[PDB]
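User: quick one, sequence for these C-alpha cells?
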C-alpha cells in the first residue's frame, strides 16, 4: 500500500487517471453504456470481455496489465430507497475487496449511482459515505473523479472535515 494512504478528488475524465487501476460505474450486462462507462469503454475496450456481473457486485478484467474493476451500483429508478442503499453499500465493499486482492497502491474511483442511476436525486453525500465506509480499511491512495465544479468543492470539504 501507499506510505501515507490518502483521499483526493479531481474534476476531469476518469479515463485520463494517474492511478494503478480504475473503477468503472458499470451496468450489469457489460454494455458500453454512457458517462463514466462510455469513457472506460473508449479507453479500455478489452476490459469488457465477460465484465457482466450483478447489481451490488464488482468484477475485475485486465486491459493488458491495467486492472478495470466493473462495479455495478443500483439504478434508484428500479430500486426502493431502502434496497437501493443496501446494494450501493455492497458495490463499494466489493470494490475494497478487489483493490486489496490486486495489491495496487492507488485507485481512481467515481461516485456510483449519482448520474443516470440516481433516479433524479442528489446522492453525493450518500454515495461518498458508502465509498468511505468500504475504503477506510484499505491502504491504497484513493482518487475520486467528478465533473461538476460544486460537487468537487463538496467532496473536497467532506475529505478535509475528517482530517
Ligand atoms: C469522471 C467522469 N469521467 C467521464 N468521462 C464521465 C463522467 C465522469 Br463523472
Ligand atoms: Cl478532462
Ligand atoms: Cl450513475
Ligand atoms: Cl460530477
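Assistant:
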Amino acid at each position: 500500500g501507499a506510505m501515507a494512504p490518502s483521499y483526493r478528488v479531481k474534476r476531469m475524465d476518469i479515463a485520463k487517471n494517474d492511478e494503478e487501476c480504475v473503477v468503472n460505474a458499470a451496468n450489469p450486462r457489460g454494455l458500453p453504456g454512457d458517462g463514466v462507462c462510455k469513457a472506460v469503454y473508449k479507453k479500455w475496450p478489452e476490459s469488457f470481455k465477460n465484465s457482466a456481473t450483478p447489481v451490488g457486485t464488482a468484477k475485475t478484467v485486465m486491459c493488458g496489465t491495467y486492472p478495470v474493476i466493473h462495479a455495478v451500483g443500483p439504478n434508484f429508478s428500479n430500486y426502493t430507497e431502502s434496497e437501493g442503499d443496501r446494494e450501493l453499500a455492497a458495490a463499494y465493499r466489493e470494490v475494497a475487496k478487489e483493490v486489496t486482492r490486486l495489491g495496487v497502491n492507488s485507485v481512481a474511483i467515481p461516485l456510483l449511482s449519482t448520474g443516470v442511476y440516481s433516479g433524479g436525486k442528489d446522492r453525493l453525500t450518500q454515495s461518498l459515505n458508502h465509498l468511505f465506509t468500504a475504503m477506510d480499511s484499505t491502504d491504497a491512495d484513493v482518487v475520486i473523479y467528478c465533473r461538476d465544479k460544486e460537487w468537487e468543492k463538496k467532496i473536497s470539504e467532506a475529505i478535509q472535515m475528517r482530517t
